């Protein structure tokens, strides 16, 4: 643990500085160090962890998609053979992405999820688990794909079950979980109808609960509701 000698509070402070400097790899290393101190994470700290890894893996996913598109074009009929290089470099990016997902899943399993008892922590971590299995599924092939897909589904489902029992329909964690599980259904599980139904039901149940919210909470919830609507517009 390269961060073992740094104070927890200093790691959190440096994660916030790294965010301001758009140094997301550093931010993720600092937050991994903070998690490895063994204490539970506050709400702000959980979001620093997720922001950091989401940006790291997001860049990897964007690069993988560029390389996979080039690879597929090089394998079509009529294209010139340019050797193993595109595949090799796509594989390098893919292995680095899988390593990031393995790291995040390892933090969740040792030991964030098992110590998370409040809905706002447990749902957050189970959503993360679904998300990082989903990123693995995006690059997986064959039977490995099936088991990865089911692990994503299982984590999202447990998060959904808790969120419906313990959170209001406008809670931003609940909304973002539903948004992402809906995308899982559409893009990963080949279940577009389930994706559309989930997005619509989530949006409509949140709409009906907005009246209970302050102006700041209303802003947070309607922002994610607009993403649900955006996806519904893309899909219908």
């Amino acid at each position: 643990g390269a961060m073992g000698s740094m104070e927890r509070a200093s790691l959190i402070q440096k994660a916030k500085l790294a965010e301001q400097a758009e140094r997301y790899e550093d931010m993720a290393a600092f937050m991994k160090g903070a998690v490895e101190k063994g204490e539970e994470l506050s709400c702000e700290e959980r979001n620093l962890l997720s922001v950091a890894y989401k940006n790291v893996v997001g860049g990897q996913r964007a690069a993988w998609r560029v390389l996979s598109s080039i690879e597929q074009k090089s394998n079509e009929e009529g294209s010139e053979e340019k050797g193993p290089e595109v595949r090799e470099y796509r594989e390098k990016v893919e292995t680095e992405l899988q390593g990031v997902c393995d790291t995040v899943l390892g933090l969740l399993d040792s030991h964030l999820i098992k110590e998370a008892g409040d809905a706002e922590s447990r749902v957050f971590y189970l959503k993360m688990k679904g998300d990082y299995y989903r990123y693995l599924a995006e690059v997986a092939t064959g039977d490995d794909k099936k088991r990865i897909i089911d692990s994503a589904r299982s984590a999202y489902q447990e998060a959904m079950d808790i969120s419906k029992k313990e959170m209001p329909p406008t809670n931003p964690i609940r909304l973002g979980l539903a948004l992402n599980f809906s995308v899982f259904h559409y893009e990963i599980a080949n279940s577009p109808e389930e994706a559309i139904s989930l997005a619509k039901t989530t949006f409509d149940e949140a709409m009906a609960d907005l009246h209970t919210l302050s102006e700041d909470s209303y802003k947070d919830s309607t922002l994610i509701m607009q993403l649900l609507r955006d996806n519904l517009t893309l899909w219908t």
């Binding site: 992402n180 893009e187 996806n231 893309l234 899909w235």
Partner: peptide
């Protein structure tokens, strides 16, 4: 691509 958070 669709929106996720």
């Amino acid at each position: 691509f669709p929106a996720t958070v």
